[PDB]
Amino acid sequence: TVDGLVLDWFKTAKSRVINPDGTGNIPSQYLLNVRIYRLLSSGLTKLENEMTVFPVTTGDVTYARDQVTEFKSFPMTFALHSTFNQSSSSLASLLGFSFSL
Amino acid sequence: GVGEREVGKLTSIIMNKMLFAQGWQFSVEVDGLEGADFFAKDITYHDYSIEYETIKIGGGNILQPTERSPGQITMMVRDTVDGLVLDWFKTAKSRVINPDGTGNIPSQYLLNVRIYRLLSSGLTKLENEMTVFPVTTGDVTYARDQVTEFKSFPMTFALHSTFNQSSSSLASLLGFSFSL
Amino acid sequence: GVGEREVGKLTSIIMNKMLFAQGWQFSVEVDGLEGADFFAKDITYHDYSIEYETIKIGGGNILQPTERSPGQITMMVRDTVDGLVLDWFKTAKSRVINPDGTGNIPSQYLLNVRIYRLLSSGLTKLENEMTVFPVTTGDVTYARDQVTEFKSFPMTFALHSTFNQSSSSLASLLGFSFSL
Amino acid sequence: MAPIAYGVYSQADGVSPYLKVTLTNSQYQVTGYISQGAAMNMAQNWEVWEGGTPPTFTLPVTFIALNNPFIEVSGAIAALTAMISPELKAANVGGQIPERVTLNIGRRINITDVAIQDLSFDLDAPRDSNGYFLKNTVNLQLTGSSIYNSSDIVRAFQ
Amino acid sequence: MAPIAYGVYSQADGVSPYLKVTLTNSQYQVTGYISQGAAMNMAQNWEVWEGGTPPTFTLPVTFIALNNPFIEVSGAIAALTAMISPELKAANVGGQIPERVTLNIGRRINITDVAIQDLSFDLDAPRDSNGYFLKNTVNLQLTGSSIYNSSDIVRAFQ
Amino acid sequence: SQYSIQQSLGNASGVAVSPINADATLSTGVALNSSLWAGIGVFARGKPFTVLAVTESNYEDVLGEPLKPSSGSQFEPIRHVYEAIQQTSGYVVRAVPDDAKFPIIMFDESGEPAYSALPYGSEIELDSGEAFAIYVDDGDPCISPTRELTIETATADSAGNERFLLKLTQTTSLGVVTTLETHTVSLAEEAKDDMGRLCYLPTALEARSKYLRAVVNEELISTAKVTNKKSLAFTGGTNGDQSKISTAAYLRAVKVLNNAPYMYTAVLGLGCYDNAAITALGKICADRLIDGFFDVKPTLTYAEALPAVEDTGLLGTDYVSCSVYHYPFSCKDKWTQSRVVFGLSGVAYAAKARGVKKNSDVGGWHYSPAGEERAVIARASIQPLYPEDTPDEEAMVKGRLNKVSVGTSGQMIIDDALTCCTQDNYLHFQHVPSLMNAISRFFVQLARQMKHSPDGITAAGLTKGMTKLLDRFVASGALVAPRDPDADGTEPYVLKVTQAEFDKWEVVWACCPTGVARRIQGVPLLIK
Amino acid sequence: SQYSIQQSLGNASGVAVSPINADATLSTGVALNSSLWAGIGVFARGKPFTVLAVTESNYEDVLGEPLKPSSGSQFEPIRHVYEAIQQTSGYVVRAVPDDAKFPIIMFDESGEPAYSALPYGSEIELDSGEAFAIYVDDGDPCISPTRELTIETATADSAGNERFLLKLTQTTSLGVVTTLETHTVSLAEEAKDDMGRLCYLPTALEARSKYLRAVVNEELISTAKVTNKKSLAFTGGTNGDQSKISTAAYLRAVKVLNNAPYMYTAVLGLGCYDNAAITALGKICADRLIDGFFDVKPTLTYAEALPAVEDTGLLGTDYVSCSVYHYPFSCKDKWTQSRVVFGLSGVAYAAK
Amino acid sequence: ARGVKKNSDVGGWHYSPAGEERAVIARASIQPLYPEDTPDEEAMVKGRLNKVSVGTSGQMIIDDALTCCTQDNYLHFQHVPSLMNAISRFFVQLARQMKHSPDGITAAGLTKGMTKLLDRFVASGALVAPRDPDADGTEPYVLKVTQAEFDKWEVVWACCPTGVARRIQGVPLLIK
């Protein structure tokens, strides 16, 4: 968009994934539930695929001025958390994503 | 008008004309380089990638992110009458590595590259600031057959580090030198 | 006229027409070669690349420049009626390596290649001077089907060294020979 | 009931129970995953066949700090080093032993008495915000308590 | 307070304190980074279980002369060779020892008494204008002061 | 040498820094103008009985330094505006009692200084003596803290007119003297600056200084002389007792709010509990079709809280656009860390403003002003005021006021989106009045921009305006197709446009909104 | 130097240690924020009819020391909290009968003191005389230990407002004097310290002070002065009788616990045997959808304890989420090594 | 000086002039002028002087870290006022370096300089999280820049420093 909200979101996502201080974040706060649904004739949607993924890299992207007929666009790659135990929960709770050691 | 798909397209077009911008507002610049925003023509940026490992567990593998494998910046640029870009590159690589062969202090030859987003009023806002150093411009070709375009080249800069993006000003009584 | 983008474009065009030059002023030449500036048609230059290492530190990797991995020069050239370019290459490689197989002194077969920038008055100024030696012209194809262009070939020269770019004149009483 | 356990001990991991390695003693339990590289060997000595040798086992196990590293990695390695370390000065000179643990494999193959003779691993794996390890691969070397007979061995599997 | 220290001792490096390796004695401190390739091993001897063996450690550490090589590389290696080198002729025959240093890992796992039995590295790394090294990877071999019991070991971690 | 640093910047090219300051609080904020608002407050400093646009960078000084809770009942408004500022600017109107008097310093023909004090609103007159006078209008009593003035001379102009400089400074309780500004000015009737700026005394004073105004006798300006004076501090001026607040001041401020020629879609109680003022603001909300944010006394337990709604007098079908708030708990001060109590009205306004402002085309007016994104009070150490007292759900529902419950992480959510609309009609919600107000606005500006146009096109412009505005609403999701296809059809909206004469065009539009889900039902059972 | 050890901290900097006395207590811990319990009990100290988020850090401090088991039937709650807090924290509520009274000391215009005692919950008012007064609220009858105050002048504020420093302390029977606070305050309404700390008397009392609350005449505060009074002890405080507790107090505790907006996953009996209280707690458990750990009187044999459950009346589908226990035994006191009987409710909750 | 310049990048002024890390003197044959007289710690700290004693190793040690500030405010410590002095000096140096420059880039340059200065400060550890997160959260710095006229860029900056526990106290407790 005008404001680069997608890049903003990616920045936030990778920040939550990995501490810039370098430490390992809990693999529960930075996990996102991506889902593709199939539409209907009435506009309704039905589940088709739901994955629990995390960002890894957007790839080597090129930006210039020669893009004189199309907009600068980029891909983002997300890796699933696991092919086993596709589980998730809501952070919005008294017992958050933190745990007891 | 009142059909579902007409409503959908109307919503889409309104929010598109209200929230979309072309790759118009952008500016690349480097400390110590004058007109580089003009002479540069292309940019390709990668901060860093993060690597995962697979672990075998039953019928499934679990991949976990380890570590930020760093990236690089590559800038495609045309030069001027005097070759000021080549001059700057020569100076940069000279400061990076002693032609005598010794290792220079990794503080004097580090440059702060920054890309900002423009505004409707011409103002700029920070978008990405890296601390990088030159490495190589690549194998470039020069000839006379370039009969419709100017000889231009890319330069690759490697970031100093994906950790502690720090810099300071040499213009001081206590310069970039240190006490042993 | 008074709009911000009109001002920007005006500034850009003025400074472009005042500071831009096409790849016009250039000249490649080699000691001992007459007309080579003419017969050469293309040049591809690389002084040297500098290699980094990654070091794992926490969540970050730090890359540091070590060492100048050297480059090479490659010149695309068409020859004359007599094949004087092939003659020169024959002589050069002969001086480089003894057909008897022994190693020649790496001072007699070293050539000083130089590219200068021309001026509006035809004068030239130094742009890059390398001390190189021939290595190989590559796998070249020759036939009769070249019915609209001339048989032309590239030659690759390797620099003697990325360190101590020194040379001297053989035309002296104390020649390139030494005392054991 | 049972004493304290470490590793992926609870079913909350949502993983197949069969693929879990388990060690248990009077006061400690450690549960993990059957990782690649496992091997075992039995042999004998001769010159005329003289005798046999006790069973030998080489088990590499991978541990993951999925949710609680304190119980899954740190406590696990602490229990492991406690078990391998011979406690022969616990103010009970009338019976001090280096201690042996019982091994369960695939929930059906049980070794009642086995000695953890060697342990090793790497600590260079990445950590958490507190600093507990996220991953490790601990290799273990195990010995039978005696040279078990065929009647002892063959009739012990499921 | 503490005596002289070398390596990335100050916080000015801006690096996570947890990932720092630290060795400390009465007069010298060396601080570095937990590099890959670290390993440790504990074992015992038998033939009938006879006894045990002290802990062993193989720690490779990488040192970077980010700003001050004299204190970060040269002084560090000097302190290291001083510690490993047995000082048994320091005009104090009534008590000369090869000296042992205390190790801190992850700021929470402490080995009070460990002996630096072996050291090695390479000097071929690039240098500065003065000539001090920019980088090195020093591998170390360490031994426990005794065959520590389970009660000694398991209760020493955090 | 050149290393020693002076106190403050004078006229030299250099750097002067102030002594380090600890008791100084300053915060970051950029307004986006999502919901223009104002309110009636009683503060320190600032012009009373006047609208002042307060941004995220002036409430510190133009609104005055925040007072404490124990200083009367005037911490409620400062706290309220404190939470309000983090969303958008305000148009606050300050009120002072009759005890407030501003100080005046009169300079005679020879510059002889005298001090006086006059009540605000009272005019200023000069006798035969006291050639002119100067009075401060910033609202500061000049005694806590204190400010001083200094008068010196300078070079003359081209016409030879005498020029004198005035410098202002502020002094704290400790005694630290810090300059603020300085300005030269010439007493000449036709005094001009070398830039051509007007150097006429009151004119130059009002042009440069935003703190001091002056009155000059036309018959004594010619004979007025100047002198060098130092440490000129106003005396005798103070706001008086701000605890005592008058209904006359309340109504005057309401009149100021009405006559304010600026847009404002929301109004606040902002610590005001006077019944007459509440009724006046309710009438203002009714006759300006805007939203009101009235609040009641927090000290009222649920027993007397219920009759307070009737005691408001705003119950009815007209005063439905407004909302009434209460906060029966105790919190901890951010600044003085004291057990304090103040209403949640401003917090609720900020919550709904944030929740609406994320939407782009028109804003989610239909959004429930609650949820983790919005319903967050979290001031400090929230404790109940009256643990003994107990509310009643059905009595509360028929009372139509907003209560509050527990949230996700132990924080405390407004569990209500119901206005004071007595009748249980679909407009008794909060999102419905929001949509009438929004559509009223859009209709107003479209009509006003198409106003006074040649005939034959107005109907068409209205048609496309309706289509586009429905486009924005359907994009926002606020309006949907009707749930009754057989009898009520499937069209989310319908339009009627026509005219009666050369004037008096008429439009009637119907729309069907969407749901909000402010109550939920759930039933457990087991298969055993 | 490092050799000196102090007792109280003022301007001098040093490291202090515990004095040589006859008795001492400790309480240290961190909050759980995982799963909580609630229950009514009678203890030492603490405000009556008041909820208290008790943890391992305050269990022994603000609840006072454990009482004698033979000193009434108030030992069941103290044993329960002792056994439960070692592993889990709670939101325990405490109330006392009206017989208890808290003391207060009044300073007149000249600052002369007058001692008085009033029943808990009673509000003191200031007439023409009685310039101001300060009453203790922690619930201690100021008898073991005693509360003393020392007041004198101090440096003024940046505004020059006259300021006085007062220090509060507790003095034991043996003479150990441990201070609790030492604060400089001023009569000035707008009294601001150089830190920006407010020095106003009532605000300071309510904010920083935690055991004493002051009432001041707003019309005589201006004309009020200060005096020098050292080690002023409260008298007339009384804890009252706790063996018999009114059903009215029981129901007041029940309803305030109901109205309390604090999370607790379970409710504990704390040894109460009031049938009405037990039923009220059962209905609280039912309508709040939690677990309850009720208990029956251990003193009755099995034959009559079996009917005791419906004698209490907690049998039914409403009280389905609760459990009721019985402890027909007697163990040894941890301190007085005597035959002590208390329920298993706290340990059962802890185990769960 | 030696303590601050132990750090190599910018130095750390947050160091306390007490303890035997710096306060070791032990010149020769120390003789107390008034062996019977002993200093009074509270009156000394009120008087803002600096008192001395002997450590265990016999060295002479200065057991004070306070300046001559009459008021008990946070300026009455020693390292912290030096911290403000150092940060102010660096700010002055950078402002003079960027001084006399055409407008339109001055704001960006000053922001970048202050941000990198903050980076060096957080590396040095002097900049630490606020004591009370209720007001400012854990973010310990704030900056704004405004304009008055053709000149007078008014820049305002507030930071959270650290401390070295000048208020000295302790209490161990029993369990029986």
GROMACS .gro file of N, CA and C in nm, chain F residues 58-107:
model
  150
  835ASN      N    1   0.100   2.108   2.361
  835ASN     CA    2   0.073   2.233   2.431
  835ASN      C    3  -0.005   2.216   2.560
  836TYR      N    4  -0.069   2.101   2.583
  836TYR     CA    5  -0.145   2.082   2.706
  836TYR      C    6  -0.057   2.099   2.830
  837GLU      N    7   0.074   2.083   2.814
  837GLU     CA    8   0.164   2.102   2.927
  837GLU      C    9   0.162   2.246   2.976
  838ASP      N   10   0.164   2.343   2.884
  838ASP     CA   11   0.181   2.482   2.923
  838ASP      C   12   0.056   2.567   2.901
  839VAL      N   13  -0.001   2.565   2.780
  839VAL     CA   14  -0.117   2.650   2.757
  839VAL      C   15  -0.234   2.604   2.842
  840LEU      N   16  -0.248   2.474   2.864
  840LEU     CA   17  -0.348   2.424   2.957
  840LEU      C   18  -0.302   2.438   3.101
  841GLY      N   19  -0.173   2.456   3.124
  841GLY     CA   20  -0.119   2.470   3.257
  841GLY      C   21  -0.066   2.339   3.312
  842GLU      N   22   0.013   2.350   3.418
  842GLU     CA   23   0.070   2.232   3.482
  842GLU      C   24  -0.040   2.156   3.555
  843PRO      N   25  -0.044   2.023   3.544
  843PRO     CA   26  -0.149   1.947   3.611
  843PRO      C   27  -0.146   1.965   3.762
  844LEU      N   28  -0.264   1.981   3.820
  844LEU     CA   29  -0.277   1.998   3.964
  844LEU      C   30  -0.283   1.860   4.029
  845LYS      N   31  -0.311   1.857   4.155
  845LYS     CA   32  -0.315   1.726   4.218
  845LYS      C   33  -0.459   1.689   4.252
  846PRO      N   34  -0.490   1.563   4.284
  846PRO     CA   35  -0.629   1.532   4.321
  846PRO      C   36  -0.677   1.606   4.445
  847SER      N   37  -0.591   1.626   4.545
  847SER     CA   38  -0.636   1.687   4.669
  847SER      C   39  -0.673   1.834   4.652
  848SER      N   40  -0.626   1.898   4.545
  848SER     CA   41  -0.657   2.038   4.518
  848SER      C   42  -0.797   2.046   4.458
  849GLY      N   43  -0.897   2.038   4.546
  849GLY     CA   44  -1.035   2.046   4.501
  849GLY      C   45  -1.073   1.926   4.415
  850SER      N   46  -1.165   1.951   4.322
  850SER     CA   47  -1.217   1.848   4.234
  850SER      C   48  -1.179   1.877   4.089
  851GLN      N   49  -1.055   1.920   4.068
  851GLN     CA   50  -1.011   1.965   3.937
  851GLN      C   51  -0.903   1.877   3.876
  852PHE      N   52  -0.868   1.766   3.940
  852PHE     CA   53  -0.780   1.668   3.877
  852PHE      C   54  -0.853   1.580   3.777
  853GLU      N   55  -0.984   1.561   3.795
  853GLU     CA   56  -1.061   1.484   3.699
  853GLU      C   57  -1.046   1.537   3.557
  854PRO      N   58  -1.063   1.667   3.530
  854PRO     CA   59  -1.051   1.712   3.391
  854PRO      C   60  -0.911   1.700   3.335
  855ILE      N   61  -0.808   1.728   3.416
  855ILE     CA   62  -0.672   1.719   3.364
  855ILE      C   63  -0.638   1.574   3.333
  856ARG      N   64  -0.679   1.480   3.418
  856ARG     CA   65  -0.658   1.340   3.385
  856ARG      C   66  -0.736   1.301   3.261
  857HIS      N   67  -0.861   1.345   3.251
  857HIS     CA   68  -0.944   1.310   3.136
  857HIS      C   69  -0.879   1.355   3.007
  858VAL      N   70  -0.836   1.481   3.001
  858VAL     CA   71  -0.770   1.529   2.881
  858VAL      C   72  -0.637   1.457   2.862
  859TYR      N   73  -0.575   1.411   2.971
  859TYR     CA   74  -0.451   1.336   2.958
  859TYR      C   75  -0.473   1.210   2.876
  860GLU      N   76  -0.578   1.133   2.907
  860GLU     CA   77  -0.599   1.016   2.823
  860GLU      C   78  -0.656   1.055   2.687
  861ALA      N   79  -0.728   1.167   2.679
  861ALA     CA   80  -0.790   1.204   2.552
  861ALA      C   81  -0.686   1.244   2.448
  862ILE      N   82  -0.576   1.306   2.491
  862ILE     CA   83  -0.482   1.362   2.396
  862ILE      C   84  -0.415   1.256   2.311
  863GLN      N   85  -0.404   1.133   2.360
  863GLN     CA   86  -0.329   1.031   2.287
  863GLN      C   87  -0.401   0.983   2.162
  864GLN      N   88  -0.513   1.046   2.126
  864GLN     CA   89  -0.582   1.012   2.003
  864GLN      C   90  -0.591   1.129   1.907
  865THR      N   91  -0.645   1.242   1.951
  865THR     CA   92  -0.658   1.358   1.864
  865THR      C   93  -0.673   1.482   1.950
  866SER      N   94  -0.655   1.597   1.886
  866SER     CA   95  -0.654   1.725   1.954
  866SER      C   96  -0.794   1.760   2.005
  867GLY      N   97  -0.799   1.863   2.089
  867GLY     CA   98  -0.924   1.908   2.146
  867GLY      C   99  -0.943   2.057   2.127
  868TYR      N  100  -1.063   2.102   2.162
  868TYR     CA  101  -1.101   2.242   2.151
  868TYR      C  102  -1.150   2.292   2.286
  869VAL      N  103  -1.069   2.270   2.390
  869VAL     CA  104  -1.118   2.282   2.527
  869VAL      C  105  -1.152   2.427   2.559
  870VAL      N  106  -1.252   2.445   2.646
  870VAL     CA  107  -1.290   2.577   2.694
  870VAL      C  108  -1.268   2.580   2.844
  871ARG      N  109  -1.186   2.674   2.890
  871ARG     CA  110  -1.154   2.688   3.031
  871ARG      C  111  -1.247   2.790   3.096
  872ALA      N  112  -1.285   2.761   3.220
  872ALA     CA  113  -1.374   2.848   3.296
  872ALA      C  114  -1.310   2.878   3.431
  873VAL      N  115  -1.327   3.002   3.476
  873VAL     CA  116  -1.274   3.044   3.606
  873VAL      C  117  -1.386   3.111   3.685
  874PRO      N  118  -1.381   3.109   3.817
  874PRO     CA  119  -1.484   3.177   3.897
  874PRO      C  120  -1.460   3.327   3.895
  875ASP      N  121  -1.549   3.399   3.963
  875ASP     CA  122  -1.535   3.543   3.975
  875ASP      C  123  -1.410   3.583   4.053
  876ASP      N  124  -1.355   3.493   4.134
  876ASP     CA  125  -1.236   3.525   4.211
  876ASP      C  126  -1.113   3.544   4.123
  877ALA      N  127  -1.115   3.492   4.001
  877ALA     CA  128  -1.000   3.505   3.913
  877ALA      C  129  -0.983   3.649   3.867
  878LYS      N  130  -0.863   3.702   3.887
  878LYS     CA  131  -0.826   3.836   3.845
  878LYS      C  132  -0.687   3.829   3.783
  879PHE      N  133  -0.670   3.894   3.675
  879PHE     CA  134  -0.540   3.902   3.612
  879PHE      C  135  -0.466   4.028   3.657
  880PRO      N  136  -0.334   4.021   3.662
  880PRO     CA  137  -0.255   4.137   3.704
  880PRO      C  138  -0.220   4.230   3.589
  881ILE      N  139  -0.205   4.358   3.624
  881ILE     CA  140  -0.176   4.464   3.529
  881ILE      C  141  -0.066   4.551   3.588
  882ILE      N  142   0.028   4.593   3.505
  882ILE     CA  143   0.132   4.687   3.545
  882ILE      C  144   0.118   4.811   3.459
  883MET      N  145   0.096   4.925   3.524
  883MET     CA  146   0.076   5.052   3.456
  883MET      C  147   0.204   5.133   3.462
  884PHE      N  148   0.250   5.180   3.347
  884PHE     CA  149   0.365   5.268   3.338
  884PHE      C  150   0.318   5.410   3.310
   0.00000   0.00000   0.00000
